Amino acid sequence: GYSLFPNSPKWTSKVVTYRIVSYTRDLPHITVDRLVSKALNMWGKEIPLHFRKVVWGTADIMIGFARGAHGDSYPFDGPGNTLAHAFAPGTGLGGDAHFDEDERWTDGSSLGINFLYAATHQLGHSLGMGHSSDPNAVMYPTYNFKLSQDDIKGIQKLYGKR
Amino acid sequence: XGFVX
Ligand SMILES: [Ca+2]
Ligand SMILES: [Ca+2]
Ligand SMILES: [Zn+2]
Ligand SMILES: [Zn+2]
């Protein structure tokens, strides 16, 4: 089933700040905002953790779209291959979640990768979930849904139950 | 992709 990260990195405060630093032309900004909020709450409802959106400066979870190299050692690779990636909880790059601008992202109303699904996966890694061996899990390593029992068991193992 | 760092 579920994986964490080695030595169970996790947010050490009850409040975790997040910021959407860069948007996609594929979607209205407010749509990315609402879907990120929905993704975070799918995890947050299970655990004693609150998310706070900020619109400036450096939040704990920095979220954004980028093409090619974007300041970490994991440059994006244009259309196809890698779609997105995210970092275990920690300072700086830890918690951050990046989406490749060279794909197409949808709110469900158009053609594209489902951004809610993808953001729930990435933000799982942003909270300290690794990949699951359970094909029903949002944290399964490969790409209308809910967290699986495995997803919920894993996140509650790391943070405890709300 | 989930990375450490
Ligand atoms: Ca961070
Ligand atoms: Ca790509
Ligand atoms: Zn990145
Ligand atoms: Zn992943």
Q: Which domain holds residue A93?
A: 1-162
CB contact under 8 A, A88 and B2: yes
Minimal Cα–Cα distance from B2 to chain A, Å?
5
CB contact under 8 A, A74 and B3: yes
DSSP single-letter state for residue B3: B
What is the spatial distance between Cα A89 and Cα B5, in angstroms, rounded to a whole number? Answer: 9
Question: Looking at the CA of A78, which ligand is closest?
Answer: 2
Minimal Cα–Cα distance from A85 to chain B, Å?
5
Domain count, chain A: 1
CA A90 to each of CA A5, A86, A126, A133, B1: distance values in angstroms, whole numbers, following the listed order: 12, 12, 9, 25, 18
Residue A103 burial by CB count (10 A; 0-12/13-18/19+): exposed, middle or buried? buried
CA-nearest of A145, A49, A36 to A96 is A36
Among B1, B4, B5, select the one facing A82 at the smallest CB separation: B1
How was it solved?
X-ray
| CA dihedral sign, ordered A39, A42, A47, A50 | positive
